[PDB]
Design an enzyme around this catalytic site. Structure first.
Site, PDB file in Angstrom:
ATOM      1  N   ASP A  45       5.528  -5.528   4.656  1.00  0.00           N
ATOM      2  CA  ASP A  45       6.689  -6.138   4.430  1.00  0.00           C
ATOM      3  C   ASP A  45       7.669  -6.704   5.346  1.00  0.00           C
ATOM      4  OD1 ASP A  45       6.763  -5.327   1.694  1.00  0.00           O
ATOM      5  OD2 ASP A  45       6.877  -3.362   2.162  1.00  0.00           O
ATOM      6  N   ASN A 119      16.623  -7.296   2.175  1.00  0.00           N
ATOM      7  CA  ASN A 119      16.525  -5.908   1.825  1.00  0.00           C
ATOM      8  C   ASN A 119      18.043  -5.537   2.098  1.00  0.00           C
ATOM      9  OD1 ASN A 119      13.946  -5.071   1.523  1.00  0.00           O
ATOM     10  ND2 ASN A 119      13.677  -4.268   3.283  1.00  0.00           N
ATOM     11  N   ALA A 159      14.452   0.609   0.121  1.00  0.00           N
ATOM     12  CA  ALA A 159      13.869   0.526   1.617  1.00  0.00           C
ATOM     13  C   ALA A 159      14.924   1.511   1.979  1.00  0.00           C
ATOM     14  CB  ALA A 159      14.004  -0.865   2.146  1.00  0.00           C
ATOM     15  N   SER A 163      16.367   5.943   1.716  1.00  0.00           N
ATOM     16  CA  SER A 163      16.441   7.064   2.482  1.00  0.00           C
ATOM     17  C   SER A 163      17.937   7.686   2.753  1.00  0.00           C
ATOM     18  CB  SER A 163      15.975   6.479   3.822  1.00  0.00           C
ATOM     19  OG  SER A 163      14.572   6.148   3.669  1.00  0.00           O
ATOM     20  N   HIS A 220      15.315  -6.740   9.359  1.00  0.00           N
ATOM     21  CA  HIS A 220      14.809  -6.027  10.772  1.00  0.00           C
ATOM     22  C   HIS A 220      15.857  -6.394  12.002  1.00  0.00           C
ATOM     23  CE1 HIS A 220      13.124  -9.852   9.584  1.00  0.00           C
ATOM     24  NE2 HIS A 220      12.730 -10.267  10.849  1.00  0.00           N
TER      25      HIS A 220
HETATM   26  C1  LIG Z   1      10.509  -3.484   9.820  1.00  0.00           C
HETATM   27  N1  LIG Z   1      11.048  -3.056   8.387  1.00  0.00           N
HETATM   28  C2  LIG Z   1      10.245  -4.029   7.391  1.00  0.00           C
HETATM   29  C3  LIG Z   1      10.290  -3.401   6.198  1.00  0.00           C
HETATM   30  C4  LIG Z   1      10.129  -3.076   4.916  1.00  0.00           C
HETATM   31  C5  LIG Z   1      10.239  -2.383   3.688  1.00  0.00           C
HETATM   32  N2  LIG Z   1      10.963  -3.124   2.688  1.00  0.00           N
HETATM   33  C6  LIG Z   1      10.869  -2.272   1.443  1.00  0.00           C
HETATM   34  C7  LIG Z   1      11.499  -2.299   0.146  1.00  0.00           C
HETATM   35  N3  LIG Z   1      12.199  -3.438  -0.150  1.00  0.00           N
HETATM   36  N4  LIG Z   1      11.032  -1.375  -0.757  1.00  0.00           N
HETATM   37  C8  LIG Z   1      10.222  -0.286  -0.212  1.00  0.00           C
HETATM   38  N5  LIG Z   1       9.350  -0.054   1.114  1.00  0.00           N
HETATM   39  C9  LIG Z   1      10.012  -1.199   1.549  1.00  0.00           C
HETATM   40  N6  LIG Z   1       9.709  -1.239   3.038  1.00  0.00           N
HETATM   41  C10 LIG Z   1       8.742  -0.530   3.874  1.00  0.00           C
HETATM   42  O1  LIG Z   1       9.570   0.468   4.483  1.00  0.00           O
HETATM   43  C11 LIG Z   1       8.833   0.804   5.681  1.00  0.00           C
HETATM   44  C12 LIG Z   1       9.373   0.061   6.990  1.00  0.00           C
HETATM   45  N7  LIG Z   1       9.207   0.911   8.257  1.00  0.00           N
HETATM   46  S1  LIG Z   1      10.052   1.943   9.081  1.00  0.00           S
HETATM   47  O2  LIG Z   1      11.250   2.249   8.215  1.00  0.00           O
HETATM   48  O3  LIG Z   1       9.113   2.910   9.431  1.00  0.00           O
HETATM   49  N8  LIG Z   1      10.429   0.778  10.317  1.00  0.00           N
HETATM   50  C13 LIG Z   1      11.649   0.590  10.688  1.00  0.00           C
HETATM   51  C14 LIG Z   1       9.247   0.281  11.025  1.00  0.00           C
HETATM   52  C15 LIG Z   1       7.471   0.303   5.470  1.00  0.00           C
HETATM   53  O4  LIG Z   1       6.456   1.242   4.794  1.00  0.00           O
HETATM   54  C16 LIG Z   1       7.685  -0.753   4.802  1.00  0.00           C
HETATM   55  O5  LIG Z   1       6.476  -1.212   3.648  1.00  0.00           O
HETATM   56  C17 LIG Z   1      12.464  -3.253   8.325  1.00  0.00           C
HETATM   57  C18 LIG Z   1      12.891  -2.376   7.413  1.00  0.00           C
HETATM   58  O6  LIG Z   1      12.809  -1.034   7.723  1.00  0.00           O
HETATM   59  C19 LIG Z   1      13.901  -0.391   6.733  1.00  0.00           C
HETATM   60  N9  LIG Z   1      14.364   0.982   7.441  1.00  0.00           N
HETATM   61  C20 LIG Z   1      14.777   0.972   8.474  1.00  0.00           C
HETATM   62  N10 LIG Z   1      15.174   2.266   8.978  1.00  0.00           N
HETATM   63  C21 LIG Z   1      14.911   3.116   7.837  1.00  0.00           C
HETATM   64  C22 LIG Z   1      14.709   4.209   7.294  1.00  0.00           C
HETATM   65  N11 LIG Z   1      15.497   5.389   8.206  1.00  0.00           N
HETATM   66  N12 LIG Z   1      14.190   4.624   6.202  1.00  0.00           N
HETATM   67  C23 LIG Z   1      13.939   3.676   5.114  1.00  0.00           C
HETATM   68  N13 LIG Z   1      13.510   2.665   5.513  1.00  0.00           N
HETATM   69  C24 LIG Z   1      14.247   2.233   7.039  1.00  0.00           C
HETATM   70  C25 LIG Z   1      15.147  -1.392   6.172  1.00  0.00           C
HETATM   71  O7  LIG Z   1      15.224  -1.297   4.898  1.00  0.00           O
HETATM   72  C26 LIG Z   1      14.412  -2.599   7.058  1.00  0.00           C
HETATM   73  O8  LIG Z   1      14.798  -3.730   6.191  1.00  0.00           O
END
Ligand SMILES: CN(CC#Cc1nc2c(N)ncnc2n1[C@@H]1O[C@H](CNS(=O)(=O)N(C)C)[C@@H](O)[C@H]1O)C[C@H]1O[C@@H](n2cnc3c(N)ncnc32)[C@H](O)[C@@H]1O
Ligand SMILES: CN(CC#Cc1nc2c(N)ncnc2n1[C@@H]1O[C@H](CNS(=O)(=O)N(C)C)[C@@H](O)[C@H]1O)C[C@H]1O[C@@H](n2cnc3c(N)ncnc32)[C@H](O)[C@@H]1O
Ligand SMILES: CN(CC#Cc1nc2c(N)ncnc2n1[C@@H]1O[C@H](CNS(=O)(=O)N(C)C)[C@@H](O)[C@H]1O)C[C@H]1O[C@@H](n2cnc3c(N)ncnc32)[C@H](O)[C@@H]1O
Ligand SMILES: CN(CC#Cc1nc2c(N)ncnc2n1[C@@H]1O[C@H](CNS(=O)(=O)N(C)C)[C@@H](O)[C@H]1O)C[C@H]1O[C@@H](n2cnc3c(N)ncnc32)[C@H](O)[C@@H]1O
Lengths: 261, 261, 261, 261
Positions: A45, A119, A159, A163, A220
């Site tokens: 993503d 997002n 996303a 959380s 991001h």
């Molecule tokens: C690098 N991210 C890309 C993405 C995405 C995404 N888009 C959706 C979607 N639309 N639907 C469902 N899954 C979704 N993902 C899943 O989110 C995981 C991301 N990796 S991570 O959060 O571990 N990271 C920071 C490495 C991964 O599985 C991916 O497939 C940015 C986004 O992280 C999000 N983020 C930031 N801090 C967060 C928190 N504390 N808890 C949860 N999300 C968090 C934020 O939304 C940003 O835009």
């Protein structure tokens, strides 16, 4: 027509990209990464989000397709094994476009910057306590004290929004959702303590109370903004378009990402 | 035109009702509680909910107005002190009608009952554990185990929905919101654990897994249903209409009920 | 005996401090800010936290008293109006000491730093995603992905811990409480999703998975740590002592800060 | 010594019970279900809870062991395949007893009933709205309005308590935890909105405000109580004892039940 392919850049995604380019070469498909009409993202993503931002000035001319080479990435419709079937279906065309809503963030200074999010857009303080007045359609609604605020699109609701305790919203709903990060609530400080869902044409403005420096993220991308007078959120008039070749309903996508697959 | 007034029944509300009836007698206003076009509720939100259900067969012919004689009841637009001003404004007419979405619940047996909700419809077990399969547009989405489920209208999102962690939704959004009551989550049992927001035309069906007896509430009204095959939720085609004489935006209404007033 | 007074530094707190010093001069009380036995903090909870950290090397020789010159600060027992009564009661002595538990944080590098917290210690990433393995008494318990983690003392449970959904714990319980900040949970990522309460002698270790740089806060103090191998939490053997002159039970203190006063 | 075995009653558990009885017959072990010293429960956590309540008058003379024939039941230490190894280890003896805290509930009328809980005691209304005054050590703490309240033991914190947002507490901590079910919070109604953790010797009393009829559950057992004056909670002086033959730490038990196994 004109297409391009972005890759996560690991060996698996680069090779899939090369193999799809070779397959496209057998049809009337020109590789063009300046003015594509199809943008294929091969990765996760994050790769898809970067592709969206690479082309955010031509969203009305582009349909996006995502292939996930890791886990089921939420914006992905295809597994790598199906790449050849995608080449074929895409070559013929006549697919159906689906549109998701987007979020517009405006940051005003003492000048103005606008950003588009697929997002979410989040705001935190640049170090000190985060305090902002939340103004909805010019109505002073609350003084927020806490770690920060997150404003999500419908597709972003699964996303960061999720959380933070937000609701998951079907992307046919033209709305944005505001969630709190660690709000303080005691005898003297009060916030609503529920996510808020806003329709199109409502404007949510955050106005600084003391400190004027904020860390603002859009998808991001995290940026320090200094001397901020106002951060404004509204549902964008712009939409992202996906090429769909088969049914994969949003609620099945949610089931497959969170319940079991 | 034709109007009627319902009262909470305490001395304060009965006297206000009598005084408004006397004021209406000075205009071309006939008291008619069979076919009113204006329904005034004097009391709290429970009084207002009962008025809605008293006239749920004529919702297209009626505009509702609420006076709160206790605290600010959420559906109320007027304090008792303003009753005379309301009589006058209503007598002249030319007010603007605003519509909120409603929720349709269908309960099928082994026969069929339908209910309309202004706040929400909830389902719990009749004693044993509550287990249902949640099916969205014919897609098996989750097996829910817990205390129960709540499906809310937009205006109901500030009611039971809010206590269960749901999002507050502006009532211009034609949607319904499903929230969990105390879901179990462990290695063997899994639910989504977020509220879900559904657009118009999506159907959420609850299907029993073992026990078939359920306690189903619609607004204040709780009923034991036996031998249930399915409970179906969808946004109703019917709407409730309010008479509005001045601006009182939903988000200010939320501010005044939850932040300060 | 020997005492000192810290002030928030606004006009109100400085003047109260000067007036209390004058009152103490009428008794056998020496002002000594190197080796006090009584430390009076005049201000808010931040002032009190700073006083605690100013004397964290002599906690066994000191009893603390807080006066709040703003709102009821949680660690404060006295309002400014009662300052003269406090001077008198303190001068005579024979008061009762009450002790609250403290939290020890150890940060190991590739070297070792220890910190003591009265409210909590938190850990976040220095920019990238936060991922740590959580190890309890050498047992690999979960891989945490999210915004960060908060480990709280009992008296800190009404502070940041509360905003993160933690339980409020009576400070007679020698424990620490771990709460999550915005954990991600989907098909591939799993955390416990509940606060965890640990007794004395349990050790919770956070171990980096990719990035090794973390922002670690201890009470108000936030520090960037680079090249971290492990962050270890345990209930400290050290305790903070309060001078108490009257009953003010913790649960009344909670009532007065959060319910009404 | 004297032992007995309770079974869930399905074919798998009954046969395991018969086979263990045959194995015990090869040692100096008398089957005695009036005065056992070892109580083996074969089934799930419900079977174990029923065994506890079958012998709640002899808790000081009994050590419990659970075998799970379904999923990993939380109170179970053994899988069916290890039954023969358990027979042997138990026959020799010299095992170590571990004790978990219990919860005492007292219900006073206008007469008095006491109950002991291993998981939790909950209180709800008998139909109307649930409103109680919460009094802690004779201090009026809050007026609770909502669906109900749950008071949990440490080992119960992974049960209903967890679904209600409570903290998981290590069972070496002699405490009880109060969690809210769907509390209402608005301008006029206020609760603490966090779980509360109480030490031994604190008493939490619920006192009716209007309706005096309540549905009170203790573990699986739900009872309608009429004409209630007070419900009182405190950590019991009684403890449940488990026979332990090997290390299976609580936090590993939590990991195995909620994270992965
Ligand atoms: C690098 N991210 C890309 C993405 C995405 C995404 N888009 C959706 C979607 N639309 N639907 C469902 N899954 C979704 N993902 C899943 O989110 C995981 C991301 N990796 S991570 O959060 O571990 N990271 C920071 C490495 C991964 O599985 C991916 O497939 C940015 C986004 O992280 C999000 N983020 C930031 N801090 C967060 C928190 N504390 N808890 C949860 N999300 C968090 C934020 O939304 C940003 O835009
Ligand atoms: C008798 N009720 C009338 C109403 C209402 C209402 N409608 C909204 C609205 N749309 N927006 C904002 N305030 C709203 N009210 C406010 O809700 C308080 C109700 N009194 S009560 O819940 O104490 N009660 C059961 C006596 C009161 O202030 C009133 O003005 C039924 C409704 O109670 C709701 N209810 C049931 N169980 C609940 C739970 N555990 N938590 C929260 N609500 C709960 C459910 O929605 C049902 O339809
Ligand atoms: C400067 N703080 C001093 C304090 C305190 C305190 N100690 C307790 C106590 N033991 N019990 C009850 N009230 C307590 N206070 C109250 O907390 C308000 C603090 N001001 S503040 O959070 O707005 N701020 C950052 C200016 C204020 O009322 C004060 O009296 C640091 C502490 O803030 C906490 N903090 C940080 N981020 C937070 C979040 N997002 N939500 C909630 N708390 C947060 C963290 O615990 C740190 O140690
Ligand atoms: C029949 N129960 C036996 C048990 C247990 C138990 N004890 C613990 C433990 N100490 N630690 C971890 N797992 C634990 N279990 C697990 O709980 C599941 C129970 N089955 S059930 O809830 O679906 N049910 C009602 C059929 C099952 O996996 C079992 O192994 C009663 C208990 O249910 C609890 N209960 C009631 N309503 C609940 C809600 N809405 N959410 C969650 N729990 C709820 C309540 O605590 C009562 O005492």
């Amino acid at each position: 027509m004109k297409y391009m392919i972005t890759s996560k850049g690991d060996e698996k995604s680069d090779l899939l990209r090369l193999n799809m380019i070779a397959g496209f070469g057998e049809y009337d498909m020109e590789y063009d990464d300046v003015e594509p009409e199809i943008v294929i993202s091969i990765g996760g993503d994050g790769t898809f989000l970067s592709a969206f931002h690479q082309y955010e000035e031509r969203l009305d001319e582009i349909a996006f397709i995502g292939i996930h080479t890791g886990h089921l990435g939420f914006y992905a419709d295809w597994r790598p094994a199906e790449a050849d079937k995608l080449v074929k279906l895409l070559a013929k065309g006549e697919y159906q476009k689906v549109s998701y809503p987007l979020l517009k963030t405006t940051v005003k200074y003492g000048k103005e910057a606008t950003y588009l999010a697929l997002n979410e857009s989040t705001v935190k303080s640049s170090g000190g306590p985060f305090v902002v007045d939340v103004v909805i359609n010019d109505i002073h609604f609350e003084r927020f004290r806490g770690d920060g605020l997150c404003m999500s699109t419908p597709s972003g609701t699964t996303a960061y929004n999720k959380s933070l305790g937000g609701a998951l919203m079907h992307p046919s709903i033209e709305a944005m959702q505001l969630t709190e990060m660690a709000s303080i609530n005691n005898r003297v400080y009060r916030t609503i303590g529920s996510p808020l869902v806003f329709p199109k044409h409502h404007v949510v403005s955050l106005q600084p109370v003391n400190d004027k420096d904020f860390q603002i993220s859009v998808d991001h991308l995290s940026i320090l903004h200094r001397d901020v007078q106002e951060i404004r959120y509204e549902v964008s008039a712009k939409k992202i378009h996906f090429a769909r070749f088969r049914s994969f309903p949003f609620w099945r996508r949610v089931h497959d990402s969170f319940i079991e697959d």
